[model samples]
Target: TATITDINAHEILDSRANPTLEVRVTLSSQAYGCAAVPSREAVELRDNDLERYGGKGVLQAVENVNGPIRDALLGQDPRSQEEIDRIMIELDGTENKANLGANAILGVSLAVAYAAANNADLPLYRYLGGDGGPFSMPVPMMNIINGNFQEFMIVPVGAPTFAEALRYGAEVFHALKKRLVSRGLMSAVGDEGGFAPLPNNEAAFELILEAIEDANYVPGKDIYLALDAASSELYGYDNNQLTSEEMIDRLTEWTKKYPVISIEDGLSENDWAGWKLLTERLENKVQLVGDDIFVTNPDILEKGIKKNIANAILVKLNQIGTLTETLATVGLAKSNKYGVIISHRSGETEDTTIADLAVATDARQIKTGSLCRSDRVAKYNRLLQIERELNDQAPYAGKEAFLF
Candidate 1:
């Protein structure tokens, strides 16, 4: 069996292309090895870019948590997945009430669980529950820096056909994976040999969107497009640039041309007034989400619920700081009947912790990152694996069955 081998921290550029602090905790056993990455940023300053909490604080929490957790588990039984999770929760205890603390615990716990399950030769979900299915790969997308705001959409890669769309996604994955491999990281699933393609700012975004739109129309079934503003729209040069009303109006135009299913952080987090305006205009037309607004703090959600900010909320563990707080915020959002899109940060590592957390919490939607980044892909990859293992065990297992 594996004991805690190493807990490491590194600062790296996140998806936003901003420097972020990341933590990777590795657990090793005779038969298997697993690691988890947990990341966060400071929230005090708007430009700090770490979201709400500090990464250094999370590191401290990790150190505090790694001990008791590893000590409690040791060589007892690596296969006791449920017991491990329960003990994780117990280790969290009241500390879970704090976001940074809980996130640290979650990161370490995920690594521990992953190592244990690897030793048992079980997929993470297989041990957690008994359900399985073929995986659905959501197209990876990045919020490209467009104009003054971070304009988000999928990268266009294929010809204007359904098969072309899949081909494009596959090509993009391979190209991105090559870069990671060049940097000494593991080559991702399905990634083969490919030269790194230079960024095509001029037409890449438009082509991708066009391809998606074309595919959606080629088929008869429903398809949806989503955008993550990520609060970039909140603070800008001037107030007249794009008022909440004007923003929604423009989004409405985009919605007409594309099957825009959802929009996250269309307005700023602190702009409750702007949020109300946008919600009134676009609530029924599209699913508006709040990531910066909620920040995984129940108190913020309380205000958001009272204000009727948007139709949905995006949940992230490190946004506010703790697993307990994050989950509590998620529960509050659900109670308020807001759609939840469990999300990942741009500056992240190979921590599949959030992936399991998303499944265990029953979030219908999840956001990782564009295909270019491993920090984002790892979560989605783990989720796909978890889904497969779950369905394999219980043929008739319905959704939300394993939320316990």
Candidate 2:
């Protein structure tokens, strides 16, 4: 039951209709596991021919998985996750895994976990978390509105349970829509399920604040706001061409006035000097997250932690390319007392792994986008089910998830 019999790969369409690799592992007990490779960086292997899928086809990765990868792990044990991940890395033999690609390696890496869990007749969280006892349900950061370089999200920082947190945000989501229409702005949402009603993010924050009040929730008390600046996009500067100091000053003003609990990517990926300054300025007042900055690489995250970069990290499975590496990074983040936010990519699948992962790893928060779209909703639904299973053991992280 623990023996891996076969490994297979296929090309599949993600939420954005892009081609990604999906790997399936069949064990001796006839139990199987499958995972979709989510891309968070330039490490995914895509054929650059403009004629096919606009040069985004992942045929090379599929071939790599089915050929060399499958040939290497034919009779290996699926239970040895770390060793299995290391075997693939050793096979690739590249420091950055460009030859086999992170997508190819991660797909097989995740599938082995699922396959082993099935062999053990245990849920994924149970398999990974073991006897950790109490399980923590992460607070959802719902994106109800958007800015060109920002995602204006509402965090239910005071909900009694995960289910209640879902409802609180859902009501606020609808109320925000109503208010937007009343103000004669568009309500159509983006791939992240947020309304792109304005280019000016300043007014966008105000609209979210008003929506929370209209939904009968108290700002900062019952619910609060979070920002995903995605500021690498804002790095080159806008028409305003604000410097790093100017950007941090603006964020400080917002944090001072609004109930903003977190900010993701407050600066560009390479702006370490600015990150040190930002961390010193708002480290205690807000949960500063390093997304593009850390790139979810554990080594870089270690470097960031040493330099006092931010209070939190955005954990995306694909960023580091293996479940083992992702877990290690989360562990490292937690050991340092930094808030870990298990996250999702804009291009997602119905795979609910992150939901279980969030519970297994005891991450206090989850940033899986908004309250709409089946791709994003899949994660929330999985969390609901996990909470149901946890029953009395499930404790929702509220204000405690923040830096404060």
The CA lDDT of each predicted structure is 0.52, 0.87
Which numbered prediction scores highest in lDDT against the true structure?
2
Listed in order, each prediction's TM-score against the native is: 0.61, 0.97
Please, what are the lDDT tens digits per residue for candidate 1 over residues 22-124? 4444555555444433442223111232553333324344445445555665554545545655666565565333423544455544555555666667665
Give the per-residue lDDT digits (tens) of candidate 2, residues 32-80. 9988876535277888879999999999999999999998888899999
What lDDT score goes with residue 42 in model 2?
A: 29
Give the local distance difference test score of model 2.
0.87
Query: How many angstroms is residue 62 displaced in model 1 relative to the true structure, after the best TM-score fit?
Result: 6.1
Native-structure RMSD, model 2: 1.5
